[PDB]
Write a protein that binds this ligand. Structure first.
Ligand SMILES: Nc1ncnc2c1ncn2[C@@H]1O[C@H](COP(=O)([O-])OC(=O)[C@@H]([NH3+])Cc2c[nH]cn2)[C@@H](O)[C@H]1O
Ligand SMILES: Nc1ncnc2c1ncn2[C@@H]1O[C@H](COP(=O)([O-])OC(=O)[C@@H]([NH3+])Cc2c[nH]cn2)[C@@H](O)[C@H]1O
Lengths: 364, 386
């Protein structure tokens, strides 16, 4: 017997912390849903040439970060360090791009071999967004408006700055960049043009932006994206315009918990089901299942493994149950169930056929 | 151009939709039982899988995707989730003298020959409960699954196979007999006393719940950490290679992996097999369109107007899916794009409308369009959509 630890730089998100993640995620997804964007799920592993061909060879990602390995069949495989390439790839592969428009988003883990700190993980997660078929600066502005809406939704708008600039400058890129700035101004979105802003990836053409934070609630940048009109062709498909971005969920989760500790998730248990005595378990479990039928949306946990009423009532407190449906030998024979409000301590005996209604009132 | 690694799929917008509807329902039912989500790393030290799953098992022998890290360490993309789960639990002190009712969803990697229900990158939704011994929690897990089947309406196409493989002793006693017969040419008979009680109590609980099962004495799982209770939910619609959900006890794994002995039980399900079984048995488990309202808008400097009205309508109509057309196009092109997405209504925004402060609300299903003041469109849409 020995202990195996987690690969350094790879994290486990425990029960308490995932509850926050679930809230933040759903909010993000909900807003994406309101703009008409569809979800696409892509492979964690792709062939190495994809990342070499797309990201660029003199990039520090390709140079020193990819987690690459050789498959049983000699093929070199690489665990995705970002997600646009795979997207484009899947796009070209199923023929979703040629003379079509797609507004997609994706979420999942990315991998990069890096020396961990505040916001640098070896296994990290991105919410990414990509649109195909639209060139003008209009769509460029829609994406920024979308990010903007996310900040407001999460209550962190006063902690993210927007950086902007074009790496085309040539005439066309100027008109296009100007139009973008102008849409932003109209939207009342506050920006800062930065001449030295260039992304670490070699596939961006005109537009390049970045939302940043000072709380280092991220690693500075929290979201970053840009346009890449040539990547579809470069990877073997007919030329199509494209733009998107991806955000560091860990950074985001960090920024929110910092800007507003007033954020919380619903507790896990609403009702705890205490039961003790000879042959009560089947009764208790049968009741629990009925309460589940009648009370859709209630989080009810059935104690298991015996324990006296004192221990069980304490388990109810551990979980944060507000109500406790109790049931011993008597209740079972009499066809009742003791409903105990753990907040006021007021318990009452109710006929089982009426417990659902009672709980309903106690929970609001 | 590059293709995808064989045995690893892409889930497109169309099907993605069916996955989220199925996943939600799953997560919702897990929530109604008080189970918490836990998230674990996709890669772990190879020795964990070797230690946990067993050396002479098919997974370890020929399916894992191992490789070396820059520092010499052996890394393995997980082929299952229980090991990572137990590991993370011992590592953060979540199991000692504690109870947990966890679940997780994610990818699992196995190097197998791709078939109808076998892929190299597959997804599991699993459940692990630590700290409870008796057959009660075992029965709960089986009921949890039954609720899912009903929720998804495939209850009629999934059977339950059950079996007890007793304790270490019984299995080490069954060897002599088994092996002896093997050299030459039943498990239930070497089952220690304690294991027979446990399995009977378990069975006694399922009958009462009205859950139908079938004891299968040749049912052993393909992993080596399991102890008493063992089960699999199987479908004849071959929506899978057969088995859609499978699990069992594994009381000794937490200690073996270097922690204090705590009991544990869990299971994991193949989402692909499930999604397949559902689309099969439930012919039209239709998901809703990605677009409700499409925003037409052509004319001089109309876009800032359109994008602005669009932002307002999102604030007023939370829940609606509204897509703002982009890249120009004549009303004819745009109305077509609306059809493409399946928008039921279109709010048109020409040059007049900008000036007159109106917007035309076009009911795509009946063609009857009307001009409404912008302060009243939200209310107008609200009605058209019900
Ligand atoms: N090791 C890490 N640990 C934690 N968070 C990290 C790590 N590396 C990057 N991030 C997060 O991911 C964001 C985007 O990463 P990137 O700068 O490599 O660009 C891109 O990925 C492009 N794919 C953006 C894109 C998508 N579509 C178009 N352009 C960063 O701003 C940061 O929040
Ligand atoms: N290549 C594949 N493609 C698609 N689906 C697949 C593939 N391999 C396995 N599955 C799914 O994973 C389930 C569990 O099969 P398993 O025998 O690998 O055991 C286990 O995973 C145990 N760890 C379950 C467990 C957790 N806790 C206790 N027992 C199968 O019933 C099937 O639905």
């Amino acid at each position: 017997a020995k202990n195996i630890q987690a690969i350094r730089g790879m994290n486990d998100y425990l029960p308490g912390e995932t509850a926050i993640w679930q809230r933040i995620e759903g909010t993000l997804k909900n807003v994406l849903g309101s703009y008409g964007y569809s979800e696409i799920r892509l492979p964690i592993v792709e062939q190495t040439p994809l990342f070499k061909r797309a990201i660029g060879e003199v990039t520090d990602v390709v140079e020193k970060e990819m987690y690459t390995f050789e498959d049983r069949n000699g093929d070199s495989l690489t665990l995705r360090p970002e997600g646009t390439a795979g997207c484009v790839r899947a796009g070209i592969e199923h023929g979703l791009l040629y003379n079509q428009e797609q507004r997609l988003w994706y979420i999942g883990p990315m991998f990069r071999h890096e020396r961990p700190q505040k916001g640098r993980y070896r296994q990290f997660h991105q919410l990414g967004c990509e649109v195909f078929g639209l060139q003008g600066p209009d769509i460029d502005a829609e994406l920024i408006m979308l990010t903007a809406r996310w900040w407001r939704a999460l209550g962190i708008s006063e902690h993210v700055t927007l950086e902007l600039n074009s790496i085309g400058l040539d005439e066309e890129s100027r008109e296009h960049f100007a139009g973008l700035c102008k849409l932003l101004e109209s939207a009342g979105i506050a920006y800062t043009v930065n001449q030295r802003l260039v992304r670490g990836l070699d596939y961006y053409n005109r537009t390049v932006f970045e939302w940043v934070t000072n709380s280092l609630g991220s690693q500075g940048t929290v979201c970053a994206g840009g346009r890449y009109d040539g990547l579809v062709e470069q990877l073997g498909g007919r030329a199509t315009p494209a733009v998107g971005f991806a955000m560091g969920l860990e950074r985001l989760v960090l920024l929110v918990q910092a800007v507003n500790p007033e954020f919380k998730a619903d507790p896990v248990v609403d009702i705890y089901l205490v039961a003790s005595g000879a042959d009560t378990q089947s009764a208790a479990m049968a009741l629990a299942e009925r309460l589940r039928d009648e009370l859709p949306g209630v989080k009810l946990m059935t104690n298991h493994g015996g324990g006296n009423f004192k221990k069980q009532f304490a388990r109810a407190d551990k979980w944060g149950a507000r109500v406790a449906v109790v049931l011993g030998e008597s209740e079972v024979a009499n066809g009742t169930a003791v409903v105990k409000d753990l907040r006021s301590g007021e318990q009452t005996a109710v006929a089982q056929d009426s417990v659902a209604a009672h709980l309903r009132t106690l929970l609001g």
